[model samples]
Target: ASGRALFQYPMTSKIELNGEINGKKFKVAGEGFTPSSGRFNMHAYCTTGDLPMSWVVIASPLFHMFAHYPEDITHFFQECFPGSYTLDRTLRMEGDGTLTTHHEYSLEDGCVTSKTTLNASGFDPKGATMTKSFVKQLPCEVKITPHGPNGIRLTSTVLYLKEDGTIQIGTQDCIVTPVGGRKVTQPKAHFLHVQIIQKKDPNDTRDHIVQTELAVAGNLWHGMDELYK
Candidate 1:
């Protein structure tokens, strides 16, 4: 198979791999999360060779929507894994891969939390097989930050994963208020089964962007079937 095909459907393995992020070498592993709607269940394990502890994060599929604001899902990573200096650049690999650019956030102490934008254009015979057709664009200003006591706040633009691979973009104008000032809580890895969709026609009585019921596992990693009722 060409490199492009390999990227779309990576090799299935139980072995571990290694790579470097911001000059730090980390041991890596791939575990399937479970695919639902537009979100796929997958995670890449990152750990330092010397440190016994490890950090498990929602794989690239879920990582793509960190800018969903109130979900502030992206901030979870930055807070847990603080770093110094980040890499942001777009590259076209053998596969139809196109990375727009990495948005690096400088921490107060010089640490960095970066948001990398990547797209697979298409496939190539000699070079990368996956070819990213368009540059994946997202509004960065609405993302969560550490300035406030809550650390991050959810903006109006909320997105969900669809059954297909394409993302369902939400509107930014709608206002959804949390009930009783209670924060909207979600299940762990719940983001894996969602397709970010915005509510174009919100009901005036309620202060919410969008609402839907989906099948979800109960407890931490619930299956899809729960609604925000």
Candidate 2:
């Protein structure tokens, strides 16, 4: 699965999740903030669960840095900037331990590479304690492979990158097709998520680069789809 921000920096959002996960009803309320300072705070809780589910994910300034990438290369990936988002801290009341989710992405001419990392300390969904370890979430390692004209595939695998080397926790095949656009200019723009256009400061005209806060970054746009809604 893939996730992207709906709002821009210096913004606060009120999100509601009322649905079922595995036939069980779950109502979750979330509040997220991306300040101009580059730090992000995401908090969420369950309103109807007797067990009480609540957590907070605090990411470093890298998220802010990712937003303002080199302006020239913005055409490749249209959403937020291509960079790594490292969770500085995480608190899960349900686990009574902690968790961390790190994400990375780099943009190229024809394709982009993405990665996700999971770190946990004494946390488990089954109410069990676990040793500190690193794990894979979503498409741990992914890439954009353009086969032929108008053919785009996001290839994924269960690969983890560490300081020592790379490890494959499991073998799996996952890829996404980028089908978007009102008139469809480029397939790559439609594949990326959205983020708010920002400025170094409210009045810093020289710092703010024109970007799309909603829809695809810049001119590219799409209709409500299965993954987005």
Candidate 3:
């Protein structure tokens, strides 16, 4: 079975992705580092309008669902995040073979925020599961609402926490709408912007990493464009 595999990184490096998907151009830029200790930091940005509006709203949740379908983990990360990395294994709670998630919704001041947490588990590409000695958790908050006449705006913040007190922060903002007054059944377009920052700890001697200082920008065409093809 082909599953997630880990990516090897250089000591200090930067990488960029530029390509066209379904005739739409997209770009992503990232930088990462590995310090004296085994600790590493990474920052990346990606944008593509080829994605549907519904898919954009549920992107975070969809990524969390990867634990349940180990087979799709590799493609999910590569297509969504567009970076080199491996799933390693699924993280699970004690005595729980399946990973679970908790969601809380709040509406205030004309906006809704969904807070989500994924219970941890450990598993490998071939479907081997294990329990970890440390606590691993992923928490995220997403805000979404209608924008303009037919556009939707979405913003998301996420944190990856480990038992050893390591933390990584990521943020994304996107806008989706129909192009040239096209209907939902016609081709649509989207724009995405993202940023990421991380470091081991304040007291750590290693340099603080700004994974993505500038927001990564992306544009794409979707919907009926695929249907006509």
Better of 2 and 3 by TM-score: 2
> lDDT of candidate 3?
0.30
Per-residue lDDT tens digits of candidate 1, residues 131-195? 12222322222222222222222222323232344443433211111122333332122232223
> Which segments of model 3 are wrong by more than 4 Å?
1-139, 162-164, 183-229
Candidate 1 residue 182 C-alpha distance from true site, Å: 52
All candidates: TM-score: 0.20, 0.33, 0.23
lDDT of 3 by residue, 52-134 (tens): 11111122322111121123112222122222121111222223233333333232232222233333233221221221222
Q: List the candidate 2 regions with Cα displacement exceeding 4 Å.
A: 1-8, 37-39, 50-69, 75-181, 184-229
**Of candidates 3 and 1, the better by lDDT:** 3
CA error at residue 206 for candidate 1, angstroms? 43
